[PDB]
């Protein structure tokens, strides 16, 4: 029915793409359209939902849905520290960019030789949170979902513990891993079947607490 | 009304992205929207038009225009080659990458290395040269696209002109009063601001002009 009544969400959806000058980048091929999900199905469920939307400019704003819209992978990180306080749930589905050039020309850059990028790591949102809630700087935050493209249960396992998020949706093969050992199969089908098991996998979760 | 009609057009647009791995890429930020509108007012006065496309905004292929889809800088080349001696006018619009990574993996990547790059080819500069050797006998129009602005090696009209100079194609149409429209024979014309569809209306009316002189 409307499990998520007066719950308090913010999602990341999207790629990031990192400037190599004012019209160059370096992007990834994510639709964030499995994030827009995500959203629309718990605004659909009662959720009091914010969206950090990257490279989706395509995409239909979900209904219900305030949007906050964000270009780099730091400027993700500057609206997650924003928004996070305020949310009970968060939800990272955006493809963040794992690194980014070192120097960004300020100007479109122009005839022997060619350049290599020199690349320096972006900050870890997903992480950053994980180690501000259990800083006690998020009271707020019931439930951390992490997203990871990956035997899979090899590595989704280990990611889901070296990120210390309480979710872990791995390819979306598709998994919903719990930090409470819980694991199961996410049957390969569409993006709103997807968003509904995991959104009822997070209101599960916010049941058992 | 049909202006172009029989004139077999190929069409290129949006901007391309160069793989360094399955999901991630080196991309810019074009929009394709006016090359497209340009594919879009070609087909409506009667040409064949064939528009190849890269990364767009998002954009719906037009109607009763023949679509060719690719990625990087090399399948456009590629792409080109294929579908030039049919063309009749080559409307260079996109946003060719002059670089790709020198490795691509054909897996993810989860400290790093640079990326090394290698040259892409200037796939408008080929196709003058192409017809100025015999080898485009059908190809009496080729337009170039450049975005050029005012800086401290020269104005925005230096920067222009030294452009069409070096490509050496009929027209170049330069964005930057909304830009340019340069002739190979030394004709300029400010390019008024409008919508998408307004600007590829003078755009295609240049076009058809320089088509009626040559
Ligand atoms: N700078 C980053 C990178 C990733 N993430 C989040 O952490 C998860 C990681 O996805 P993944 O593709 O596995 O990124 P990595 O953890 O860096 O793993 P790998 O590089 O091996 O792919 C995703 O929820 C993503 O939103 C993040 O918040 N900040
Ligand atoms: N590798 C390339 C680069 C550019 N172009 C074409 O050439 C025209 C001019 O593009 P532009 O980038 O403006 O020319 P460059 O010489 O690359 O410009 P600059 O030297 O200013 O970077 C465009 O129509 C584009 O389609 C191309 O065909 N192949
Ligand atoms: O030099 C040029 O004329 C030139 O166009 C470029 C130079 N770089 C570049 C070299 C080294 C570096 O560290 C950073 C940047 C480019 C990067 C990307 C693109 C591009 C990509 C996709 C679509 C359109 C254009 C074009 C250029
Ligand atoms: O079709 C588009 O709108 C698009 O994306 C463009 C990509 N280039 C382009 C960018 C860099 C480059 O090196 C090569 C090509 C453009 C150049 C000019 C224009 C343009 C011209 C006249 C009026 C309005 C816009 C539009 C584009
Ligand atoms: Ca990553
Ligand atoms: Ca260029």
């Known amino acids: 029915h409307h499990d998520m009544?007066?719950?308090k969400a913010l999602v990341?959806?999207?790629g990031t793409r990192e400037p190599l000058d004012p019209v160059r980048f370096i992007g990834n091929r994510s639709s964030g359209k499995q994030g827009y999900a995500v959203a629309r199905v718990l605004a659909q469920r009662g959720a009091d939902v914010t969206l950090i939307?990257?490279?989706t400019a395509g995409?239909?704003?979900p209904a219900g849905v305030e949007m906050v819209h964000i270009g780099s992978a730091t400027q993700l990180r500057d609206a997650?520290?924003?928004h996070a306080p305020d949310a009970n749930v968060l939800v990272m589905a955006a493809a963040v960019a794992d690194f980014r050039p070192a120097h960004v020309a300020a100007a479109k850059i122009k005839a022997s030789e060619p350049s290599s990028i020199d690349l320096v790591r972006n900050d870890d949102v997903l992480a950053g949170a994980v180690r501000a809630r259990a800083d006690g700087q998020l009271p707020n935050m019931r439930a951390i979902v992490g997203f990871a493209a990956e035997d899979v249960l090899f590595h989704a396992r280990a990611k889901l513990e070296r990120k210390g998020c309480d979710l872990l949706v791995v390819n979306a093969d598709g998994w919903l891993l719990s930090?409470?050992?819980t694991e199961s199969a996410?049957?390969?089908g569409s993006k709103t079947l997807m968003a509904t098991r995991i959104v009822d996998s997070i209101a599960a979760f916010l049941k058992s607490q």
């Open 59 to 61: 995409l239909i704003d």
């Open 53 to 55: 939307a990257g490279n």
């Open 179 to 181: 930090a409470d050992g």
């Open 12 to 14: 990341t959806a999207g």
């Open 5 to 7: 009544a007066g719950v």
């Open 80 to 82: 997650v520290s924003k």
């Open 186 to 188: 996410l049957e390969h």
